[PDB]
């Protein structure tokens, strides 16, 4: 009851959950699956209680009757006086990033280039940019737009998985979990930085956290913000400082989801868990920090200040917004009330 089973996606999230489990006195416990979808099925079955999902997955989960419980809240400084847990969520910016040196690459010349995506079905990495691209070409053949990609979760023998590298020994190529080298926000940005792809579809924060010494990871130590450009929809290129005027969309924050009938209890445990291991928590940075994992974004994004309560006890459609929800429905016509599982 006052015991929550968290669902970890892959081995590194499993290991981070184990630590949290150990530290919480097993007030929190762990289940592991190989993909986010499998984790969603565990929650549906009642074998896991919760996990923190990107908005594209919140849409999947929502059709299956899962609900948003609490949202990631970022360190942005309006609503000055208001406590993090009560502060409204601001959303993040979906951007398309390229190298400066790749001159004359703009939004209007992306066809046949090489792309890096966080994973199939994700907001900044997939739903937004592909939604736009299908919209613009009036075609559903989005698997033939780019010449090669790393899009975790696509068919390992498609050109959408050609740029993916798998793990330390080349296994698990293109799995939508952190064993894939180029998975997630930092994986997709690394794919661009290493010059495997021509463009990466990530969020604004990813560029900042992995350049100018902010990272220290070996592939990122020498990366410089000036060496990157954002692609705007008007066909221009701007410095990464112009994200407010050069983005593809504003995305709803990642949120914790649970089965409706478990929402209340998952909420109370987690609010208590962040008091202990959150940003200014009793036991962070002393014993354990929930929101840290050295730019790996394990379980939660590394930039999370706190998990915030959601205004208007919203449904999943209200949490995602009509704008975004219609964008997804239209894109999914290419592959009605439903639930995939």
Ligand X SMILES: CC(=O)Nc1ccc(O)cc1
Ligand Y SMILES: *[C@@H]1O[C@H](CO)[C@@H](O[C@@H]2O[C@H](CO)[C@@H](O[C@@H]3O[C@H](CO)[C@@H](O)[C@H](O)[C@@H]3O)[C@H](O)[C@H]2NC(C)=O)[C@H](O)[C@H]1NC(C)=O
Ligand Z SMILES: *[C@@H]1O[C@H](CO)[C@@H](O[C@@H]2O[C@H](CO)[C@@H](O[C@H]3O[C@H](CO)[C@@H](O[C@@H]4O[C@H](CO)[C@@H](O)[C@H](O)[C@@H]4O)[C@H](O)[C@@H]3O)[C@H](O)[C@H]2NC(C)=O)[C@H](O)[C@H]1NC(C)=O
Binding residue per annotation — 118? yes
Contact 176, 153 (CB under 8 A): yes
Nearest distance, CB of residue 242 and ligand Z, angstroms: 8
Q: Within positions 246 to 285, which residues make up the interface with ligand NAG, using CB under 6 A?
A: 272, 276
The residue (of 180 and 205) whose beta carbon lies closer to ligand Z is: 205
Q: Is 176 exposed, middle or buried (0-12, 13-18, 19+ CB in 10 A)?
A: buried
Residue nearest ligand Y, CB atom distance = 131
User: How far, in Å, CA of 177 to CA of 15, rounded?
Assistant: 14
Q: Which of 38, 194, 242, 318 binds ligand X (CB under 6 A)?
A: 318
Q: Cβ 186 to Fe ion, closest distance in Å?
A: 12
Q: Which is nearer to Fe ion, 123 or 178 (CB)?
A: 123
CB atoms closer than 10 angstroms to residue 203: 26
Is 122 annotated to bind a ligand? Reply is: yes
Beta carbon nearer to ligand X, 11 or 314 = 314
Q: Are strands 4-9 and 28-33 parallel, antiparallel or unpaired?
A: parallel
Exposure of 177 by Cβ count < 10 A (0-12 exposed, 13-18 middle, 19+ buried)? Answer: buried
The upper half-sphere exposure of residue 104, i.e. CA atoms within 13 Å in the direction of its Cβ, equals 0
Q: Which is nearer to ligand Y, 315 or 330 (CB)?
A: 330
Of 22 and 212, nearer to ligand NAG (C-beta) is 22
Considering the complex, state which of residue 209 and residue 267 has its C-beta at the smaller distance from ligand X.
267
Report the interface residues with ligand Y, using CB under 6 A: 131-132, 135, 323, 326-327, 330
* Cα separation, 299 vs 290, whole angstroms: 8
What span, in angstroms and rounded, lies between the C-alpha atoms of 38 and 177? Answer: 11
- Residue 137 CB, shortest distance to ligand Y, in Å, is 11
32 vs 17: CA distance, rounded Å: 9
261 known member of a binding site:
no
For residue 40, give the DSSP letter: H
What number of chain residues touch Fe ion (CB under 5 A)? 2
d(CA 290, CA 277): 5
Specify the length of the chain in residues: 341
Q: How far is the CB of 67 from ligand X (least distance, A)?
A: 12
**According to the binding rule CB under 6 A, does residue 316 interact with ligand X?**
no
286 contributes a contact to ligand NAG by CB under 6 A: no
Query: With the CA atoms of 32, 19, 185 and 168 taken in that order, what torsion angle do they form, in degrees rounded to the nearest 10?
Result: -70
- Contact (Cβ atoms closer than 8 angstroms) between residue 110 and residue 235: no
Q: Is 92 annotated as a binding residue?
A: yes
Which helix (H) or strand (E) segment holds residue 73: the answer is strand 66-74
Residue 318 C-beta: closest distance to Zn ion, Å: 5
**How far is Cα 30 from Cα 39, in angstroms, rounded to an integer?**
11
Instruction: Report the residue number, 154 or 240, with the smaller CB distance to Zn ion.
Output: 240
- Closest residue to bound ligand X by CB: 321
Q: Is 87 flagged in the annotation as binding?
A: no
CA distance 232 to 162: 26
H or E element in which residue 52 lies:
strand 50-53
Binding mask 34-73 for Fe ion (x = CB under 5 A): --------------------x-------------------
How large is the angle between the packed helices 11-23 and 263-277, nearest 10 degrees? 80
Q: How far is the CB of 244 from ligand Y (least distance, A)?
A: 19
Nearer to ligand X, 90 or 294 (CB): 90
> Which 220-259 residues touch ligand X, going by CB under 6 A?
252
Site for ligand NAG (CB under 6 A): which residue of 11, 15, 18, 27? 27
Binding residues (CB under 6 A) for ligand X: these are 89, 252, 310-312, 314, 318-319, 321
Known binding-site residue numbers:
54, 92, 118, 122, 124-125, 185, 254
Binding-site residues from annotation for Fe(3+): 54, 92, 185, 254
């Amino acid at each position: 009851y006052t015991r929550v089973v968290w669902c970890a996606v892959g081995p590194e999230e499993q290991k981070k959950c184990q630590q949290w489990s150990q530290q919480s006195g097993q007030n929190v416990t762990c289940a592991t699956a190989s993909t986010t979808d499998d984790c969603i099925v565990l929650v549906l079955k009642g074998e896991a209680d919760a996990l923190n999902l990107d908005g594209g997955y919140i849409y999947t989960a929502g059709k299956c009757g899962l609900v948003p419980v609490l949202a990631e809240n970022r360190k942005s400084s309006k609503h000055s006086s208001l406590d993090c847990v009560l502060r409204p969520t601001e959303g993040y910016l979906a951007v398309a990033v390229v190298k400066k040196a790749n001159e004359g690459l703009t939004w209007n010349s992306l066809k046949d280039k090489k792309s890096c995506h966080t994973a199939v079905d994700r907001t900044a990495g997939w739903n937004i940019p592909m939604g736009l691209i299908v919209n613009q070409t009036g075609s559903c053949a989005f698997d033939e737009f780019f010449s090669q990609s790393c899009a975790p979760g696509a068919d390992p023998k498609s050109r959408l998985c050609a740029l993916c590298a798998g793990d330390d020994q080349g296994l698990d190529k293109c799995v939508p979990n952190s064993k894939e080298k180029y998975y997630g926000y930092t994986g997709a940005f690394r794919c661009l930085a290493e010059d495997v792809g021509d463009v990466a579809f990530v969020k604004n924060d990813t560029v900042w956290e992995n350049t100018n010494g902010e990272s220290t990871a070996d592939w990122a130590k020498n990366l410089k913000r000036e060496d990157f450009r954002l692609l705007c929809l008007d066909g221009t290129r701007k410095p990464v400082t112009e994200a407010q005027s050069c983005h593809l969309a504003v995305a709803p924050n990642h949120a914790v989801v649970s089965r409706s009938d478990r929402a209340a209890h998952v909420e109370q445990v987690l609010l208590h868990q962040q008091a202990l291991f959150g940003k200014n928590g009793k036991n962070c940075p002393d014993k354990f920090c929930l929101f840290k994992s050295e730019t790996k974004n394990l379980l939660f994004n590394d930039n999370t200040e706190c998990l915030a309560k959601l205004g208007g006890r919203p449904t999943y459609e209200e949490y995602l917004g009509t704008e975004y929800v219609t964008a997804i429905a239209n894109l999914k016509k290419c592959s009605l009330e439903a639930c995939a599982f």
